[PDB]
């Protein structure tokens with residue numbers, strides 16, 4: 001991976017490598033997503049979930065939500081990748097979180113980027129102004145927030161108003177990841193990923209973590225590809241055996257377009273190679289990522 005990385009850098013073939021993945025990527029139908037009645041549930045006409053892996057809402061009216069279950073069998077971890085919710089799909093979004101029993105939500109975009117709306121304000125910004133999604137019978141309250149320089153971690157309480165059951169949902173918000181861009185450095189990305197891991201949100205005891213950006217494929221795909229590769233390195237107890245391009249193709253069987261630019265692919269290599277140090281036993285690299293990230 002490292003020598004393949006340098007080989008690609010030397011010859012400047014990141015674009016060629018990335019285009020090959022695009023050409024080889026799976027193509028499955030997205031009939032449900034394309035139904036006329038679901039047009040207002042899709043943020044982008046060219047980003048849809050495959051029918052075979054789409055998440056179904058547990059409601060009779062219309063069970064559609066632009067979200068995909070990325071089930072990585074060998075690594076033993078599943079993620080739900082979804083688009084940033086629209087003003088009319090925020091209730092659907094939390095219904096999915098509730099039904100799929102997710103413990104964490106990872107957001108990699110901002111509500112507004114470069115002057116345009118990319119995601120609805122689907123969570124409460126203030127403790128005293130909780131949100132009620134009447135269409136879904138759910139209530140969401142901000143309990144507390146831990147604000148860092150480039151990301152914020154929020155504690156939310158989600159309540160099923162019908163049963164009165166409540167659950168704590170952790171919200172991991174990366175606020176400086178530019179659209180179609182990459183994190184400031186491998187260290188800041190890994191420090192964030194390990195914060196999510198240490199929280200317990202990715203544990204198989206919970207439902208799949210929900211990951212999203214604006215379309216739920218570029219930044220979200222980068223986040224999941226790095227996490228799955230690192231997980232696979234330890235799962236196999238053989239880090240050098242992990243082929244990142246093959247892992248990306250496997251993930252693309254579940255949702256189209258994961259990793260949206262050749263540079264995000266390049267960053268993925270960088271993050272995984274650096275992350276492999278922790279897998280290889282370096283018990284000091286984690287604290288180094290934290291320092292290099294300047295989260296204070």
Ligand SMILES: O=C1C[C@@H](c2ccc(C[C@H](NC(=O)C(F)(F)F)c3nc4cc(C(F)(F)F)ccc4[nH]3)cc2)S(=O)(=O)N1
Nearest residue numbers: 044045046047179180181213214215216217218219220260
């Ligand atoms: O890093 C990223 C890219 C974002 C992204 C936003 C929106 C779309 C769909 C959008 N659709 C639409 O805008 C529309 F529905 F088709 F009009 C979209 N933006 C595009 C830009 C180019 C580019 F190469 F020229 F940059 C090519 C195709 C594009 N599709 C895809 C990815 S993300 O939220 O997935 N993270």
Ligand SMILES: [Mg+2]
Nearest residue numbers: 125126127128
């Ligand atoms: Mg206040």
